């Protein structure tokens, strides 16, 4: 049949698998990646942020980016044929259409890649755990690059696709949201650091409980249904070192699936919270105590001060459309500095 | 320190309601386990 | 009504007990500081 022939052709064993999912994935992936290169090489951010943003202007890989649209655009999808650019590609790039382009095509790209994981899994005949695990990263992208700005004033406050720009998004969320104080973010950190820990410790353990299946010092060449490393020896070792060890390989591998993925999901909850400015910014008890008692100080209050500094100074440069004017006498600062 | 009183409840209730839950399951689990290990 | 055949026993090994206790108590630590505010 027609559809059956389509399916047969799409699911052929090529050097690069395609599939139906490929129909969605490859165009959008290509366009997102390409838009990032195009923007970081040629397009500026002079009319949106008042910043040089491309190699053409003199940016390096660290300071170049595809910046967010102008704040005045709001949450406009900013179509090329939209009522803002009206077909004009130049004005489109000057407005910040490349950001929405990259974001949307990147989103549908992620959908397509997850669908690719599902499809290949089903075709081969495996359990779809790769896709689930990948639901993780998706949650990060959706919450941070879509939900957070949608909750805010405009796409302008969404992260700009670039190194130093992402750094800016970071310090922004610290100074304005006290993002480090948010328990969901703490769970995220737990997830990532725990993930890296698990990766390292599993790798090292397997590598150092290997069976002598060869004569060469190169143990790599010496590798079947037999386990290449001693699970019992590993168990013994970590039981006597750490007090507790794995005993079930299946549980182990699931665990080092679970930890990082969960991290990502939790931090995403947090970010939605910040989309509505529903922050974990303060501890009212300590603020009241400190208000009444000028001798009371914790690292929390110190960080509150730090946030205030961040906000002033950067506020003037990071939000040019606001026309913020802070005379040098109102800027918070300590003695001498 | 002026704190939110409900916290107390929250915490304790939170902490103690799953804890009990777990314990219940565990012990009955083991009971059954024992039985099955015994008649084998 | 008749005896139900869909009934199944529930298991919880000691490892899951300890992981559960650890999860609950640790979560408690964290959010406790946020609940008291």
């Amino acid at each position: 049949g027609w559809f059956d022939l389509l399916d047969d052709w799409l699911k052929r064993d090529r050097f690069v698998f395609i599939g139906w999912s490929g129909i969605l994935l490859f165009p959008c992936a290509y366009l997102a990646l390409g838009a990032w290169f195009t923007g970081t090489t040629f397009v500026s951010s002079w009319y949106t942020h008042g910043l040089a943003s491309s190699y053409l202007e003199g940016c390096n890989f660290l300071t170049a980016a595809v910046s967010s649209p102008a704040n005045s655009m709001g949450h406009s999808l900013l179509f090329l044929w939209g009522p803002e650019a009206q077909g004009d590609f130049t004005r489109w790039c000057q407005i910040g259409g490349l950001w929405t382009f990259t974001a949307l095509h990147g989103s549908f790209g992620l959908i397509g890649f997850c669908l690719r994981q599902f499809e290949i899994a089903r075709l081969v005949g495996l359990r779809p755990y790769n896709a689930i695990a990948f639901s993780g990263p998706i949650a990060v992208f959706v919450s941070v690059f879509l939900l957070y700005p949608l909750g805010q004033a405009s796409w302008f406050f969404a992260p700009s696709f670039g190194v130093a720009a992402i750094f800016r998004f970071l310090l922004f969320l610290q100074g304005f949201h006290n993002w480090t104080l948010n328990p969901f973010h703490m769970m995220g950190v737990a997830g990532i650091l725990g993930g890296a820990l698990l990766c390292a410790i599993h790798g090292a353990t397997v590598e150092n409980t290997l069976f002598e299946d060869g004569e060469a010092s190169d143990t790599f060449r010496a590798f079947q249904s037999e386990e290449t490393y001693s699970m019992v020896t590993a168990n013994r070792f970590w039981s006597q070192i750490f007090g507790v060890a794995f005993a079930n390989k299946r549980w182990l591998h699931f665990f080092l699936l679970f930890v990082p993925v969960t991290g990502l999901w939790v931090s995403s909850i947090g970010i939605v919270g910040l989309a509505l400015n529903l922050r974990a910014y303060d501890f009212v008890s300590q603020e009241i105590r400190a208000a009444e008692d000028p001798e009371f100080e914790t690292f929390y209050t110190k960080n509150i001060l730090l946030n205030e500094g961040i906000r002033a100074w950067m506020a003037a440069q990071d939000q040019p459309h606001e026309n913020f004017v802070f005379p040098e006498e109102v800027l918070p600062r300590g003695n001498a500095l | 320190m002026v704190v939110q009183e409900g916290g107390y409840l929250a915490v304790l209730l939170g902490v103690l309601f799953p804890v009990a839950f777990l314990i219940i399951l565990y012990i009955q689990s083991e009971a059954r386990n024992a039985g099955m290990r015994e008649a084998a | 009504s008749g005896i139900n055949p869909n009934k199944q026993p529930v298991e919880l090994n000691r490892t899951s007990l300890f992981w559960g206790l650890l999860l609950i108590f640790v979560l408690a630590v964290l959010f406790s500081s946020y609940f008291f505010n």
């Binding site: - | 902490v15 | 650890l22 008291f36």
Partner: peptide, 30 residues
């Protein structure tokens, strides 16, 4: 006296750890 609650939770966690180590069910080889 939230300090009481914090101390309680910490002691709880540490106890859970202690029993997880010295009162684990022993792994048995196949």
């Amino acid at each position: 006296m939230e300090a009481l609650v914090y101390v309680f939770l910490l002691i709880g966690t540490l106890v859970v750890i202690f029993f997880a180590i010295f009162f684990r069910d022993p792994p048995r080889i196949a």
